[PDB]
Amino acid sequence: NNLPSIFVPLVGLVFPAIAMASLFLHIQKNK
Amino acid sequence: ERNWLRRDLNVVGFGLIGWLAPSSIPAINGKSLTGLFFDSIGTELAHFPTPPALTSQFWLWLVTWHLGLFLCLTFGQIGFKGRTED
Amino acid sequence: DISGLTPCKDSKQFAKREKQQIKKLESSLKLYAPESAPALALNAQIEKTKRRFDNYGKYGLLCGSDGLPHLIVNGDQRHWGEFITPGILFLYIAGWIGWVGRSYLIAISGEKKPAMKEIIIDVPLASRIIFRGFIWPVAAYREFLNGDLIAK
Amino acid sequence: SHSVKIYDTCIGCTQCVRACPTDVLEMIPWDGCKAKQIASAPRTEDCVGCKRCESACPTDFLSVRVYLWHETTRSMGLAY
Amino acid sequence: LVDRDPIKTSFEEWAKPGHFSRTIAKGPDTTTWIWNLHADAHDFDSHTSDLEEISRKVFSAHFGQLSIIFLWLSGMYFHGARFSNYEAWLSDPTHIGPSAQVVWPIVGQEILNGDVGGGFRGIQITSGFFQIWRASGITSELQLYCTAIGALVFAALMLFAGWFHYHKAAPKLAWFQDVESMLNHHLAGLLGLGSLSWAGHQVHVSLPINQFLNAGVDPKEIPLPHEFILNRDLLAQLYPSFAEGATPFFTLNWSKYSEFLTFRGGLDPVTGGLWLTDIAHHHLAIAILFLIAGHMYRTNWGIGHGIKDILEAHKGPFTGQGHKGLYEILTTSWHAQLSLNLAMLGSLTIIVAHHMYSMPPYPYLATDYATQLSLFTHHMWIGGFLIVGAAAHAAIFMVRDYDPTNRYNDLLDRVLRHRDAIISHLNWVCIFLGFHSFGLYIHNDTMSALGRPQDMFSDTAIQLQPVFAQWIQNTHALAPGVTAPGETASTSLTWGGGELVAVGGKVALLPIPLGTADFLVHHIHAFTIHVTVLILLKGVLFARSSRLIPDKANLGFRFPCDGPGRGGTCQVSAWDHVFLGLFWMYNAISVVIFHFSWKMQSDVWGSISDQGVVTHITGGNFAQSSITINGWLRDFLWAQASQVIQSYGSSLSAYGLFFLGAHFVWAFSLMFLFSGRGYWQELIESIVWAHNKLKVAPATQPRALSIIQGRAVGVTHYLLGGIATTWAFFLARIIAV
Amino acid sequence: MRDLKTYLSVAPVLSTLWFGSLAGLLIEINRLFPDALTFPF
Amino acid sequence: TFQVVQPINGDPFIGSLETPVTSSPLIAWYLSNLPGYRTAVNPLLRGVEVGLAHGFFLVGPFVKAGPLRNTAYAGSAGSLAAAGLVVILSMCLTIYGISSFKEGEPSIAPSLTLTGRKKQPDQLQTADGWAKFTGGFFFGGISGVTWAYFLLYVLDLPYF
Ligand code: CLA
Numbered sequence A: 001n002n003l004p005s006i007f008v009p010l011v012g013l014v015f016p017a018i019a020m021a022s023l024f025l026h027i028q029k030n031k
Numbered sequence B: 001e002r003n004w005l006r007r008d009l010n011v012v013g014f015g016l017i018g019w020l021a022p023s024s025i026p027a028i029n030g031k032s033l034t035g036l037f038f039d040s041i042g043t044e045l046a047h048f049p050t051p052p053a054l055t056s057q058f059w060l061w062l063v064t065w066h067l068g069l070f071l072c073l074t075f076g077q078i079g080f081k082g083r084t085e086d
Numbered sequence C: 001d002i003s004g005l006t007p008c009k010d011s012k013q014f015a016k017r018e019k020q021q022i023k024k025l026e027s028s029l030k031l032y033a034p035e036s037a038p039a040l041a042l043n044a045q046i047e048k049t050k051r052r053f054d055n056y057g058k059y060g061l062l063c064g065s066d067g068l069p070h071l072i073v074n075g076d077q078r079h080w081g082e083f084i085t086p087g088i089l090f091l092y093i094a095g096w097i098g099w100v101g102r103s104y105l106i107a108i109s110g111e112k113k114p115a116m117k118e119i120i121i122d123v124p125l126a127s128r129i130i131f132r133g134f135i136w137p138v139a140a141y142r143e144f145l146n147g148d149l150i151a152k
Numbered sequence D: 001s002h003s004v005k006i007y008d009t010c011i012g013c014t015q016c017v018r019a020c021p022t023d024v025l026e027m028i029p030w031d032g033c034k035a036k037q038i039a040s041a042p043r044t045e046d047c048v049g050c051k052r053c054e055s056a057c058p059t060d061f062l063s064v065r066v067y068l069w070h071e072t073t074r075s076m077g078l079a080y
Numbered sequence E: 001l002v003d004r005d006p007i008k009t010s011f012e013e014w015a016k017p018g019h020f021s022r023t024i025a026k027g028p029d030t031t032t033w034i035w036n037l038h039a040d041a042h043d044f045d046s047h048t049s050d051l052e053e054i055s056r057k058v059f060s061a062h063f064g065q066l067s068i069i070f071l072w073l074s075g076m077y078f079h080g081a082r083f084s085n086y087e088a089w090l091s092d093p094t095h096i097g098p099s100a101q102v103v104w105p106i107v108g109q110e111i112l113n114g115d116v117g118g119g120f121r122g123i124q125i126t127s128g129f130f131q132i133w134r135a136s137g138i139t140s141e142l143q144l145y146c147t148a149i150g151a152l153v154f155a156a157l158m159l160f161a162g163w164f165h166y167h168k169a170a171p172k173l174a175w176f177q178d179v180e181s182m183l184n185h186h187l188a189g190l191l192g193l194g195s196l197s198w199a200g201h202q203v204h205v206s207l208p209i210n211q212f213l214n215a216g217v218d219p220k221e222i223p224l225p226h227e228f229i230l231n232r233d234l235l236a237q238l239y240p241s242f243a244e245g246a247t248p249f250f251t252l253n254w255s256k257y258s259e260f261l262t263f264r265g266g267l268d269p270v271t272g273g274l275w276l277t278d279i280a281h282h283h284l285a286i287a288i289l290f291l292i293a294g295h296m297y298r299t300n301w302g303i304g305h306g307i308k309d310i311l312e313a314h315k316g317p318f319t320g321q322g323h324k325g326l327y328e329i330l331t332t333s334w335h336a337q338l339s340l341n342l343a344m345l346g347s348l349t350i351i352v353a354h355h356m357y358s359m360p361p362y363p364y365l366a367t368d369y370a371t372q373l374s375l376f377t378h379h380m381w382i383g384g385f386l387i388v389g390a391a392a393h394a395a396i397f398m399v400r401d402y403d404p405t406n407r408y409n410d411l412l413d414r415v416l417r418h419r420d421a422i423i424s425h426l427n428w429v430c431i432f433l434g435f436h437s438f439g440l441y442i443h444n445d446t447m448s449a450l451g452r453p454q455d456m457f458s459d460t461a462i463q464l465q466p467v468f469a470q471w472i473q474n475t476h477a478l479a480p481g482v483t484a485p486g487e488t489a490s491t492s493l494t495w496g497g498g499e500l501v502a503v504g505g506k507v508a509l510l511p512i513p514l515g516t517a518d519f520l521v522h523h524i525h526a527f528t529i530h531v532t533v534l535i536l537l538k539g540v541l542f543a544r545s546s547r548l549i550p551d552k553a554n555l556g557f558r559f560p561c562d563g564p565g566r567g568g569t570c571q572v573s574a575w576d577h578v579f580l581g582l583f584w585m586y587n588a589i590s591v592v593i594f595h596f597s598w599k600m601q602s603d604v605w606g607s608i609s610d611q612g613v614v615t616h617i618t619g620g621n622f623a624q625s626s627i628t629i630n631g632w633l634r635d636f637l638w639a640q641a642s643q644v645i646q647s648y649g650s651s652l653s654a655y656g657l658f659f660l661g662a663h664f665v666w667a668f669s670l671m672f673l674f675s676g677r678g679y680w681q682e683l684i685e686s687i688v689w690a691h692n693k694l695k696v697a698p699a700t701q702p703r704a705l706s707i708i709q710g711r712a713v714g715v716t717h718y719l720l721g722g723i724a725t726t727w728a729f730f731l732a733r734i735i736a737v
Numbered sequence F: 001m002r003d004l005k006t007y008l009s010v011a012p013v014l015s016t017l018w019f020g021s022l023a024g025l026l027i028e029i030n031r032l033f034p035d036a037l038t039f040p041f
Numbered sequence G: 001t002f003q004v005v006q007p008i009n010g011d012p013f014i015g016s017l018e019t020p021v022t023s024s025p026l027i028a029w030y031l032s033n034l035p036g037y038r039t040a041v042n043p044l045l046r047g048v049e050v051g052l053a054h055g056f057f058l059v060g061p062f063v064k065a066g067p068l069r070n071t072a073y074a075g076s077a078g079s080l081a082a083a084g085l086v087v088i089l090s091m092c093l094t095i096y097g098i099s100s101f102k103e104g105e106p107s108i109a110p111s112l113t114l115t116g117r118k119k120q121p122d123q124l125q126t127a128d129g130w131a132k133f134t135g136g137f138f139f140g141g142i143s144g145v146t147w148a149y150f151l152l153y154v155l156d157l158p159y160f
């Protein structure tokens, strides 16, 4: 199939970047 | 903090002349260190832009010439400037 | 035949081990003159190897399938010399040592500075106490009966 | 800031207040010992948690006790 | 200037342990007292604050050291005369393995007396004493017996001198602070005269006897050394120039001595070592140079230099007052001198280890592979240990003897005022070297595992050529006839001349090529050395104060921590920086010795046939296999450990036993390194409880080891286990092949 | 000498003498009766 | 006697020193003219210059050392990788700017020169200034990568 050519980069490069950016913004937040 | 070298450009000419004068004596089997370096420079320009090979004698002459030249320049600066502080 | 073992004297692998060891020793002797000292040493080694194998054969040990002696420690009377008698001897000796140490420690406990008698031993008192441990079982048992063995 | 507490087994030796590397501890008058003194701990916001005071106390178990707690810029010894 | 009978000779102090310290002399309340007794035994500074007493104590201990060394030499010479096969080896050096130790047959340990040739059974030695004795002209065991007797006499003399110069006539402080006279005497007399005497011995003894031996003469038919002195006709037959006597020397006709004073270079084809005439000329020239150099410093006659005057005149626009004040520091502190001398001696030992393998100075030494490997490794380890000790004592000086109010120095003050920049730059350099040296090995491993050999850093895919070292090799190979006209051959065969020297069917030395693997391993060496220098220099520079603990100098040189505060302060003392640098020194030296062993076995050592084809021990696999960590694990550690693990039942079984014993000792150290004191003190409390129950509780209360003692035990056991394992592995591998 | 006798009673010297004598006795015992695996008497 | 090293601005109690490396007139002139130190210019224009310079450089290593260096697709793959790295760096700059700066606050840059003269604090240390800088940097980096690829693989210039 062609699905692994999409989901492997999606889980290895895109989702980690989004999660790390969101988590850094969360931990750096103050009020 | 400015003019930290106490600029005196007479050192450049004096050091260059005081290196070129003794180094021009042909005590090396009829040849001089400056002469050997200049002939090596001339030989390596015949195949421009190809660089000198690892087995060429150019590098040895370059290093040995610049060692003495730098020694003359440094000692000239120290002597010229040290006359007024001691 | 305990655990399917066989006596050493009937074991063929035991003899093969002996033959291999002797043959290995004999190949080194051919490199030296018979009168030289190394030849004498190798002769003594060969004789000692033969004597050791004969003695192991005589004592009634048990061999496995590899031709190596095995020890039985279950308490059978036919193999009491393997574990029981050396164990009793060791227990006697260890009790002697411990009793002598305890007696010396108790002897110097009443002094002004008992610590200084531990780094610099009082030789005559220890020498007098050394002989007393030869009868340690009787003294220890009587002390246990009198209740002086355990600190109150 | 850390927590520094004093108990009434104190003998008034002064050795804890001489040992502190920041001014946290001081002597106050008292009654209950021969020396007529006891240690006090008014400035525990300046405590670094070194326990030099507890190494100096001669009581069987310490008459001064330090309990490590929330850490701040002063209590971490940061000069950044 | 001495004092007559300063201290009475008596046995009274022998019966009062800890007399040197007020605290220790009280008595053993706990077991910590016993450990405190041994740790402070030789710290003479803590005993008394008088410099004269410390100097007098220091002077006498060196006599005891010399006595112990002389006893060791006497034993070494005696064992060669009585329990060796030296005389059989002297007739056939290439087929007989040297041996000088024999074992009593007790519990079956006579198996260690394996054959070595010459009708002898013993333990093969790898110290190289046989070659030393052969190069000196020694032929019979009578001479060795005489040498052992003389060494024993000298040991007795040293012991008597040590007693005398402390109990009968102890020099004053003014005698010790005469550095000009000491330097003059140690240069002109100790070194120059020793070199001249050795040159004379080589001229009159070693040259004729070694010529006779090289000619093929039976050692029992060679004339005795004194016959060459009483009979000048024999020397004239060997060397015609001896017929003219010393007349050419005094008429400046020195060219007549060219027969036995040469400048050949290279190796002797018969023996595979350096020419002895070159060695004699070298020692003569060195003696002249040291004799001249010993007339530099001023003494009672006014001519010469003053060291203080030289120091005071060296200052610059960047350094302020310069070296002014360094003369007073180095004449009042024993620790700074010790640190400087330790560093220099360690560097010299490493240089000696590097030099002795490429220019083999002894006959039949290059073809004895085990001796070469052992000497290299031994001297590398000694140099590393001395270098670490240098930093330790520098930190001790910084903590104790630093006093700017009376001993100000501008150069030391300026270093302490910018230490942050130095430490940060060294940190960055270490990180850069670690990334760009070890990372290339991980890249190679990943590319090889993924099936992409064309993307590796190697001689076939991506070359990293060390062009600077190759240029130096080319310059040194072409030196004779261009820049060294007086030389006949190059200084070493490794420069790449192209010639091969073979002795008895084995390869002695030949050119050593450099490629991609050498680049990587050299940068690994640089990285490890830089990290070690970081840990030691940080430890020295921050000994007195830091931003974390401003008052660190008041706590001393050897303290465990300053408590759990400031986030935690474990390992802040200067002692802990030496404790941590020992581990990195071990790492660096292990890597260096592994590199040496594999490179030698792969590219140099081997056997030569009749047709002239060389078969190396491992077949030249270093170039392609060492570029990966898997290669080091497989082709070096796995393959070459088969000799040591198969040694049971043979004469090499002692190495097999030591392998496992050292493994156990190394693993045993991790208990002290990973755990802390409180657990063990709590555990002892329960054990003491049952001893109280049976009335066997000691009056000396048991205590757990201190924090520093536990750290020291751990590091000592760690180093012992690792070094012993490597030692057994190397010896078992190299004796068999 | 009383002080010399005191130095001979210190722990390390006494332990060394005791262990040397013990090792000698054990070595001679194993020399007279080698390879003992069982107590035959 | 003449001495070269002096304390920073004459104050010996501030943790720095003045050396020829830090205070040489040539070095001082060179650093003052870089875009990162032009405090009186629109941050967008400095960001565009920084992006252009940094994007132009990145093409070389990716092109020459990449997994497809020995194939006909070397240049395109290298340029695409450089563009991806530029995108990642732009994301990092945006995230840093969001985390560090709050809307409506004044600048936190120093407002004193080395000679004691009062100056307007840099506007790069504000949310708006950093956003402009990041948007200039992204546009500059993409433009530099495209220019490098164009020069290397659309014009057959005699390089190397
Ligand atoms: C010429 C060389 C030299 C000299 C004269 C000294 C002299 C000194 N050093 Mg020193 N040192 C040196 C080299 C030297 N060092 C080197 C090379 C290192 C680096 C490893 C060190 C590291 C070092 C440290 C870390 C310390 C010293 C200290 C000292 C001082 C006290 C030493 C003491 O009490 O020893 C006591 C001696 C011992 C406890 C013996 C140790 C035994 C070793 C570790 C194990 C041997 C194993 C053995 C084979 C097993 C057999 C055991 C047997 C019972 C069966 C003293 C002035 C101390 C100091 O000044 O404190 C303020 C200190 O803390 N040194």
Ligand code: CLA
Residues within 6 Å of the ligand: E427, E430, E431, E432, E433, E434, E435, E438, E439, E442, E531, E534, E535, E580, E583
């Ligand atoms: C094998 C274990 C190991 C490793 C890897 C290290 C590594 C390091 N030690 Mg170290 N150390 C160790 C054991 C180890 N030590 C032990 C047992 C001790 C004794 C207690 C010490 C004691 C010690 C001291 C005292 C010091 C160090 C320091 C250092 C660092 C040196 C500077 C540098 O950049 O090096 C190069 C770094 C490496 C080789 C590690 C990187 C590994 C490769 C390159 C993989 C890279 C992956 C890459 C980044 C992508 C990953 C991304 C991820 C998503 C997968 C380095 C990180 C020093 C320090 O702090 O720095 C100066 C220092 O002062 N160590």
Ligand code: CLA
Residues within 6 Å of the ligand: C097, C098, C099, C100, C101, C102, C104, C121, C126, E686, E687, E688, E689, E690, E691, E694, E696
């Ligand atoms: C005469 C001395 C003596 C005596 C009677 C005992 C008796 C005992 N010890 Mg013990 N012990 C001793 C010395 C002694 N210990 C020493 C010196 C140490 C430090 C090495 C220990 C360390 C120790 C531990 C760690 C433990 C015991 C335990 C025990 C109990 C279990 C039985 C046993 O054998 O344990 C085994 C005992 C040992 C292996 C100790 C080694 C034997 C030493 C070498 C004997 C030394 C004798 C001494 C030199 C006497 C000199 C006499 C002379 C002056 C005349 C038992 C009550 C165990 C217990 O029940 O916990 C409470 C336990 O866990 N002991």
